[PDB]
Design a binder for this molecule. Structure first.
Ligand SMILES: [Mg+2]
Ligand SMILES: [Mg+2]
Ligand SMILES: [Mg+2]
Ligand SMILES: [Mg+2]
Ligand SMILES: [Mg+2]
Ligand SMILES: [Mg+2]
Ligand SMILES: [Mg+2]
Ligand SMILES: [Mg+2]
Ligand SMILES: [Mg+2]
Ligand SMILES: [Mg+2]
Ligand SMILES: [Mg+2]
Ligand SMILES: [Mg+2]
Ligand SMILES: [Mg+2]
Ligand SMILES: [Mg+2]
Ligand SMILES: [Mg+2]
Ligand SMILES: [Mg+2]
Ligand SMILES: [Mg+2]
Ligand SMILES: [Mg+2]
Ligand SMILES: [Mg+2]
Ligand SMILES: [Mg+2]
Ligand SMILES: [Mg+2]
Ligand SMILES: [Mg+2]
Ligand SMILES: [Mg+2]
Ligand SMILES: [Mg+2]
Ligand SMILES: [Mg+2]
Ligand SMILES: [Mg+2]
Ligand SMILES: [Mg+2]
Ligand SMILES: [Mg+2]
Ligand SMILES: [Mg+2]
Ligand SMILES: [Mg+2]
Ligand SMILES: [Mg+2]
Ligand SMILES: [Mg+2]
Ligand SMILES: [Mg+2]
Ligand SMILES: [Mg+2]
Ligand SMILES: [Mg+2]
Ligand SMILES: [Mg+2]
Ligand SMILES: [Mg+2]
Lengths: 165, 200, 47, 171, 115, 116, 48
RNA sequence: AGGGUGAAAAGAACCCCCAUCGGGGAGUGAAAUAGAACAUGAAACCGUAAGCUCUCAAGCAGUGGGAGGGGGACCAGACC
RNA sequence: GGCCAGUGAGACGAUGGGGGAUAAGCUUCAUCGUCGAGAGGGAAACAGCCCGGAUCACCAGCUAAGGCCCCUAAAUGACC
RNA sequence: CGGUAGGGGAGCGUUCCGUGUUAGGGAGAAACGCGUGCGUGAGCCGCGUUGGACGAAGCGGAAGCGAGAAUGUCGGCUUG
RNA sequence: UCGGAGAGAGGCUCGGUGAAAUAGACAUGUCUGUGAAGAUGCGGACUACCUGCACCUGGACAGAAAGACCCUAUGAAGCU
């Protein structure tokens, strides 16, 4: 601070920082509440979404679908970035009121989605070794991976209920 | 301990740090009759396409289950097999080998346990000290008079896992000679028995 | 005294798991009908 | 940074003794006040205290002279004993076999701080509650904000990393 | 022309050392041991990733088997799988095991649809 | 084990014990105050009280004993002259021990011993 | 005899701290001796 | 076997600790955190402080799972 | 055919015999298999036995030898 | 598209020379220490409160050229 | 036989000075099996809080000397 320049060894004091008045904490005024919201916000409502999930196949492995949520998947031939993609085969759809169970699949159901990115997986070291034989191999592998965003689920209402009583 | 403005301040910040940590954290949901997800955890990590590993708030040891097993004319080993299934948590959908998701078990009338064949005079419970002559053999019936409870304990211990957790799983078993137990406040229930060979 | 012990690799030939059962060896995988022709996994929309 | 105003560094260069033997004394005086150690070092059974007694006394003399501190408000914060250059020798033994011994050497580094340097700030900031403290610092400017937190209030209360989360004390 | 070893041995061993961050004792401090253990870690990693697939599967059988004995007496996992292929389902162990924990009411309906 | 053994060994054989304690009494009785270890001072109380006990019965037979014990000749003749007037009433406890810091060379617990 | 292998780094320290721990009990005796000597009431210890 | 202060000794007046050695300020210098046992100063080795953490264990010490807690100029369903 | 290597200590098992004592994880030949140079799964652990020959990734699925009370994955399944 | 002895093929990097009194460099080089970057990997590309004057890339060339072991070896430092 | 007591120097404690052989890293239990046939390190079971001091040495196929007995080399040397 300023007077610290004059002696760089003199003790600091409280009065040099601010005056000794401090007009009010104002603990009831909203100003005391506003500054709390400035440095200490709250959670607030989460992002709304549709209360639904579904199962879908990509490649040969399965995934659980939630709208407004993304997930990594195996690489897709073509499928450029920002491309509108539709996943056809779905194994079930679930809601609070009902749960549609794909027979092998749900007829005429579809999952609209978007391609976020087209990236490579984190490196995994394929290392091979045989002791007392001077055999050592160090090979990495960056797997091709895509990043899909889900938008919504449609084409499932004509399926029966199979609900719970 | 010490009530000073310095140390008292330190306790006030951590209450505030835990509070701020609690707000932006995701609330924990109990497993009993829950839907797939909520609006809160939907913004969280992918607990759906990854295996569900339990949190510490799941196996809260206070609110665990409690069972009873009347050993009056019950087969030893077959009764011990199911007790391991219930203590280890293998019957629950929330099974995890590295976590105590199971439950408690109480045994009563241990001295009335059934035993097949001539094992009452042939089965040899034994132990060793460390000397070259510290071997002490003991029959079922001789042990049945001295300590009836080691019979049940020695059988279930061989069925529980061996390691840190298995030594921790053993204390969940309570065994008693008489037809009564002091664990009334916990409100236990009768244990089911899928097998049909246990009742002579 | 005049009976060897069968200790080495012969211990494997004598003691390895075997079935020796026509009812267990004759078995095979279970047969189910084939599923219908399923649709593709993904399809592009104009974008 | 508070370390550049509170304490003083004082080193003992090339003190002919052993490292581990020194640490019997240095590990105990750590955290002891100035007057406390002088009563002890003059009465231990050890030989390592007379170099240290000259070193503890010399450091406090620098404080009142170069930074004007009161002797009664000193506390030994840090105290280290680092290895020095070891001289070597060769001693005969039986069968014409030679074994080497050595004269070790130390570099003792000692620090002396002052508690009565931030009592104007620290005793005030601790008097307030956490929530009441936010509105105080939230209304003032940055120059007044940086100065109240330049002391050891944050370290003693473990709030160094938490304040960044609330947009307070931004780098 | 003389050529010292230079720094190629140093920059090599730092990469070998940085991999050995959280190793205990001299397995994080001595070059002739870190090279001996860095070999072992990747072999164990390459071995676990192959065992990683059978392991989670092994866990899913228990969870699915554990979550279905409550429905019917004298009923079990093996009978549940035989009916799915009969009913021409396609769900794998991953989805069934997670629904058993996350939405248990669904399997109660799946059991009803089968019967 | 030393069960029932009351003797101060002082890490010396008998010929040196009989000379070491015998020599210190010569110095204490002339100086009145000396600086020695605590083990030597504890063993000294038995013998100093003996010589002082000889002075109370200041006969000729009792004097010859002190001459054989006390090395020098003048102190014994001077000892019997002053003790009956100085300790004409005391019955035992003719000396005290005051502790002291140890030495620099060997950390030996030191202590003074003096005649009351 | 001869040691088969070398002691580790932390097993060494645990044995050194015990040797250093004796200084903790020697410091208490000195502090007890000073406070029992700065009052000028003990007639059994001459310090000069 | 033992090489390297600095452009230039300007090799540190004076004050405190002080029997010396040695150290702390001052002053010199672009740099003294280049201060003479002094240039860049890796590793083993000896340490101080901080964050998590072990006293019913068992183990070529890691690896795949990852409870609870902690951390940061990018952001954060991430990363350490 | 050209250029140019290593190998020339073998091992157990099956079969066919010899030597030995129709003894040897013995020894010596002939025809095959595996290990040697071969991971993985089963066999409690266990180079030579059984299934099967690791280009790599996937928190996908069906199977082989072999198994389905618990430790420890799968029917404390059914019938004679 | 498992692979020891062993053979072939394709490449990385070190120091120095040619282009070269190169580009760049006290607006911080070499080095040292680092990294949510890239590569099949050897390594590359980048960063800096360290450092204080050197010196790439590219197209090519030459070697005192790549170390974890030789009861190796020099020096330094531990254990007991 | 049949040991016992005592003295002195060490041993033991405190202070000061302060080595050495040795040492792949070591978080270093027993039993019974297994295995290059004799395991703290693999399998199963049992036992076992952590860490020191003083004492005893069964094991670590302990340390010490590239076995000095035996054999091999178209090795060396002395002698007849
Ligand atoms: Mg036999
Ligand atoms: Mg089969
Ligand atoms: Mg070289
Ligand atoms: Mg598989
Ligand atoms: Mg002595
Ligand atoms: Mg004599
Ligand atoms: Mg420097
Ligand atoms: Mg230097
Ligand atoms: Mg226990
Ligand atoms: Mg514990
Ligand atoms: Mg041959
Ligand atoms: Mg024939
Ligand atoms: Mg043979
Ligand atoms: Mg042979
Ligand atoms: Mg082969
Ligand atoms: Mg076997
Ligand atoms: Mg199947
Ligand atoms: Mg069977
Ligand atoms: Mg099971
Ligand atoms: Mg190949
Ligand atoms: Mg192949
Ligand atoms: Mg260069
Ligand atoms: Mg320059
Ligand atoms: Mg060039
Ligand atoms: Mg004796
Ligand atoms: Mg003696
Ligand atoms: Mg000593
Ligand atoms: Mg241990
Ligand atoms: Mg065997
Ligand atoms: Mg054995
Ligand atoms: Mg192990
Ligand atoms: Mg073992
Ligand atoms: Mg001995
Ligand atoms: Mg030996
Ligand atoms: Mg030899
Ligand atoms: Mg020889
Ligand atoms: Mg020849």
């Amino acid at each position: 601070f300023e007077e610290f320049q004059r002696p760089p060894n003199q003790k600091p004091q409280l009065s040099d920082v601010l005056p000794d008045d401090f007009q009010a904490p104002e603990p009831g005024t909203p100003e005391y509440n506003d500054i709390i919201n400035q440095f200490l916000p709250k959670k607030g409502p989460p992002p709304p979404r549709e209360e639904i999930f579904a199962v879908v196949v990509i490649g040969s492995r399965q995934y659980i679908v939630i709208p407004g949520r993304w997930i990594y998947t195996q690489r897709l031939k073509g499928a450029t970035v920002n491309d509108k993609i539709v996943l056809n085969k779905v194994l079930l759809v679930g809601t609070k009121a009902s749960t549609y169970i794909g027979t092998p699949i749900v007829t005429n159901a579809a999952v609209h989605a978007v391609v976020e990115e087209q990236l490579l997986d984190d490196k995994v070291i394929v290392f091979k070794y045989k002791k007392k034989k001077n055999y050592r191999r160090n090979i990495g592998h960056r797997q091709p991976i895509t990043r899909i965003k889900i938008t919504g689920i449609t084409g499932y209402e004509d399926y029966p209920a199979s609900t719970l009583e | 301990k010490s009530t000073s403005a310095s140390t008292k301040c330190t306790e006030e910040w951590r209450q505030l740090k835990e509070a701020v940590k609690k707000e932006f954290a995701i609330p924990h949901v109990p497993l009993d009759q829950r839907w797939m997800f909520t609006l809160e955890e939907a913004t969280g990590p992918d607990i759906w396409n990854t295996t569900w590993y339990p949190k510490s708030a799941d196996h809260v040891p206070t609110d665990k289950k409690w069972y009873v097993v009347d050993a009056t004319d019950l087969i030893l080993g077959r009764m011990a097999s199911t007790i391991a299934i219930h203590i280890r948590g293998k019957n629950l959908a929330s099974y995890t080998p590295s976590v105590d998701m199971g439950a408690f078990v109480i045994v009563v009338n241990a001295d009335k346990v059934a035993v097949s064949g001539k094992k009452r005079t042939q089965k040899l419970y034994r132990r060793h000290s460390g000397r070259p002559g510290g071997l002490k053999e003991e029959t079922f019936d001789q042990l049945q008079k001295r300590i009836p409870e080691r019979i049940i304990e020695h059988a279930v211990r061989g069925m529980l896992p061996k390691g840190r957790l298995g030594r921790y799983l053993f204390n969940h078993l309570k065994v008693y000679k008489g037809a009564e137990h002091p664990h009334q406040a916990q409100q236990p229930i009768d244990l089911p028995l899928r097998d049909k060979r246990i009742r002579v | 005294s005049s009976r060897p012990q069968k200790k080495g690799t012969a211990h494997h030939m004598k003691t390895r798991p075997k079935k020796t059962a026509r009812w267990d060896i004759k078995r095979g995988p279970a047969v189910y009908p084939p599923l219908p022709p399923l649709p593709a996994e993904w399809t592009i929309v104009s974008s | 940074e508070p370390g550049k105003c509170d304490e003083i560094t004082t080193r003992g260069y090339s003190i002919s003794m052993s490292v581990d033997k020194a640490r019997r004394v240095i590990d105990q005086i750590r955290g002891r006040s100035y007057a406390e150690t002088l009563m002890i070092l003059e009465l231990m059974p050890y030989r390592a205290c007379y170099p240290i007694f000259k070193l503890i006394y010399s450091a406090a003399a620098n404080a009142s002279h170069n930074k004007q501190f009161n002797k009664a408000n000193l506390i030994i914060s840090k105290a280290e004993v680092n290895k020095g250059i070891t001289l070597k020798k060769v001693k005969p033994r039986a069968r014409g076999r030679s074994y080497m011994i050595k004269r070790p050497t130390c570099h003792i580094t000692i620090v002396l701080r002052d508690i009565t340097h931030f009592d104007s700030y620290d005793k005030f900031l601790e008097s307030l509650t956490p929530k009441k403290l936010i509105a105080l610092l939230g209304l003032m400017s940055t120059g007044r904000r940086r100065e109240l937190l330049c002391g050891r209030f944050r370290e003693n209360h473990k709030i160094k990393s938490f304040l960044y989360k609330i947009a307070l004390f931004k780098r | 022309t003389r050529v010292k070893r230079g720094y190629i041995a140093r920059r090599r061993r730092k990469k070998i050392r940085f991999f050995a961050s959280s190793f205990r004792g001299a397995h994080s401090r001595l070059t002739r041991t870190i090279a001996q253990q860095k070999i072992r870690a990747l072999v164990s990693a390459h071995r676990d990733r192959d065992r990683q697939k059978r392991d989670f599967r092994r866990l899913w059988i228990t969870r699915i088997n554990a979550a279905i004995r409550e429905r019917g007496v004298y009923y079990n996992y093996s009978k549940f799988i035989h009916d799915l292929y009969k009913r021409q389902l396609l769900l794998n162990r991953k989805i069934l095991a997670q629904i058993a924990i996350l939405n248990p009411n669904c399997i109660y309906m799946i059991y009803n649809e089968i019967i | 084990m030393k069960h029932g053994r009351k003797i101060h060994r002082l890490s010396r054989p008998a010929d040196q014990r009989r000379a070491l304690l015998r020599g210190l009494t010569t110095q204490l009785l002339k100086h009145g105050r000396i600086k020695t270890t605590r083990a030597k001072a504890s063993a000294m109380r038995k013998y100093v009280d003996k010589m002082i006990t000889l002075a109370k019965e200041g006969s000729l037979h009792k004097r010859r004993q002190a001459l054989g014990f006390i090395y020098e000749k003048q102190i014994v003749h001077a000892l019997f002259a002053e003790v009956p007037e100085r300790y004409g009433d005391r019955n035992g406890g003719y000396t005290r021990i005051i502790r002291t810091l140890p030495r620099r060379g060997d950390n030996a617990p030191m202590a003074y011993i003096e005649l009351v | 005899a001869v040691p088969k292998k070398r002691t580790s780094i932390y097993k060494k320290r645990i044995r050194k701290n015990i040797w250093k721990k004796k200084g903790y009990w020697a410091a208490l005796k000195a502090f007890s001796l000073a406070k029992s000597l700065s009052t000028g009431n003990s007639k059994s210890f001459f310090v000069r």
